Design a binder for this molecule. Sequence first.
Ligand code: SAH
Ligand code: SAH
Lengths: 371, 370
Amino acid sequence: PGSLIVVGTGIESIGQMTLQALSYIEAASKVFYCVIDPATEAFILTKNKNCVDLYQYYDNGKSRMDTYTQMAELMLKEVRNGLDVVGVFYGHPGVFVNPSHRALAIARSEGYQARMLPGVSAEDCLFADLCIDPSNPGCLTYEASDFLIRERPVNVHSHLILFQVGCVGIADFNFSGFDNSKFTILVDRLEQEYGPDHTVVHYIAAMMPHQDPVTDKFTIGQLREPEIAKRVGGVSTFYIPPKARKDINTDIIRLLEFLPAGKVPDKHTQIYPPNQWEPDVPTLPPYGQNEQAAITRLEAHAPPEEYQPLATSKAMTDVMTKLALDPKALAEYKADHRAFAQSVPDLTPQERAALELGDSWAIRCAMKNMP
Amino acid sequence: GSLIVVGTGIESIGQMTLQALSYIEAASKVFYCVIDPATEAFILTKNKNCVDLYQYYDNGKSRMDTYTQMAELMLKEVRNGLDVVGVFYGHPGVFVNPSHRALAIARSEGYQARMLPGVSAEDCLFADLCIDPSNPGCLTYEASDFLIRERPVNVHSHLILFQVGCVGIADFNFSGFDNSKFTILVDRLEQEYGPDHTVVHYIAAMMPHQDPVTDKFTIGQLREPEIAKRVGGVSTFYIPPKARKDINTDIIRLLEFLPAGKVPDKHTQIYPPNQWEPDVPTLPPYGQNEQAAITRLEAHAPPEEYQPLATSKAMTDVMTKLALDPKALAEYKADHRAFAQSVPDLTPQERAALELGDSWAIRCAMKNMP
Ligand SMILES: Nc1ncnc2c1ncn2[C@@H]1O[C@H](CSCC[C@H](N)C(=O)O)[C@@H](O)[C@H]1O
Ligand SMILES: Nc1ncnc2c1ncn2[C@@H]1O[C@H](CSCC[C@H](N)C(=O)O)[C@@H](O)[C@H]1O
């Protein structure tokens, strides 16, 4: 009896909140939120009548871990009283967020329903604004101070993302912001691992819908310029592109049959597109001889035989939207599949049967058939 | 012409962001690639002009040709002056080839190009497994690329592998992938981690009533034919740290982290522990430092420097519209004053902040009036 759901709000105000985060806000018994955008906070207050701002539990000179302990306990206290508590943290609520993990784990240890819903993180915004794929060529993400304290290894051939570069070695809080006086220690490490000429991108996603992202391209040595290091604050994130590209192992690529068997891959060339923040890698052009061949093959393209297009009804689309947008209806459906199933209007006989089964394959067959 | 690329999250409908939906509705043309029928059934009700990109896959047809065709279908509409919005499930730029190719070409030729972030499978992995990438760092690889280019592991940090069910397959089949080189991946993981180390097979729920797959195996167990069978196209591996890295005490004092009279714990991590990691010396939840912080809550008042929100409903609604209505945002960015002077019931300070547009002015207008 009593539960704790933790949701996120994304980074950019309001717009980056997920539909299910909003739905679990409204259905909550009490809301504890920690956001750093005024419109987002106002947006949370109009969707639930019982909200407490967790930001007030920071204080000047007060340890952040002590604030995190208090933030977790304020939620767990309402949980142990049998309330349905929803915790709110901007971005992804479990990405570089201490009190959410502490509160959910303690509630689990005491036998309560606990669950975190994912959200859009600052790393997600970084991928989008910088148009980089973590797949190419791998992504490593560190907390900036932990990266120094435990001397975590770099991967100069993959992406590097550093959070909290604006509070290096700071366990305190100050409403005015951080005095990043240990920033030079981080610069010393980045220079030692990458050299002073390598690129570092100072990233700050736009928090308001009309603002532009900060995507400023520096070298690591330029971070020692006073006017540069003052620009990084509490919502600053560093992206360091790969310094070089690792070679393909032709022996392993023949074992995996990535390329056609008989050919030797290109040793100094990546496939299009290039990373615009990366030192120049020889990259193939967008429209080679293999590319236009597939583009001109579009002239003779027909829907494949095994391609099965969507073929559902208005009633089936509405009931699955409801299961995704209505936590009240979802809780009833999981409690009794058939009693919920025969209650939905206008469902075709197979649609009622598929929804009563609930299996992924039955629901997909019901939405791909239709007489 | 322009190209806006958005995502839908992993779990159907519910994990779409509010701004992804608004750019769907306001779009002239929509090209989508989702793998959930209800989500696809959610999209076509929001825009009358959609094309399913999934049809450009084919049996025996190279994925790279499809990605070239997927990007070209959007690009040739962009060169014709329409406002195109491409849709890919999850985060549209996380392990997605055609989205980046189309945006790069669109940029190179001078068109407006923007990607909106979405909720990825890695985001869902963080939530369902309830782990934090900060503790102790997170390394993400494409499974085959991790093998082909012999990428280094980091046994002290998180490891996440995408596409473990498609090891080395460049082709497509509607029946899915024949993960016949999966044993090459298992060989590498055992060499780096040992056969007894944990690997979590993760499949986020795609439907609202499903529960996630969070199966705890050992790397050696992956060789069991009935284990290798259950990893497919939407499978992701999580590998917890094999050990924790030591704190460098010299670096600790360079940073002046703790009081220069107190010495921190050298071989104990903070609560909570990673429930998927081999047992690490972990602090209890309610130590005396925590209990001291609990009892100090009784004497809590809002600090003097704390500035609570103090706004109006007219101001709340205009910023909601700017975030939820892309056409009003385009108007406002084109002329702040014309937009600011046109919104009704705005306090004169509120219109002045809106006309400025600066973050400092908007935040002052929303926290100031007593
Ligand atoms: N608007 C923004 N742009 C870039 N990074 C940001 C950001 N807001 C917060 N961050 C990063 O996140 C750190 C705070 S911890 C909070 C992170 C949040 N839970 C998330 O999902 O990202 C900051 O030190 C900064 O590195
Ligand atoms: N439901 C799911 N659960 C776990 N991993 C998933 C998943 N769906 C997709 N993936 C991962 O994503 C890969 C496809 S590439 C598509 C990724 C998507 N853009 C995203 O944001 O995550 C798969 O190989 C799998 O590793």
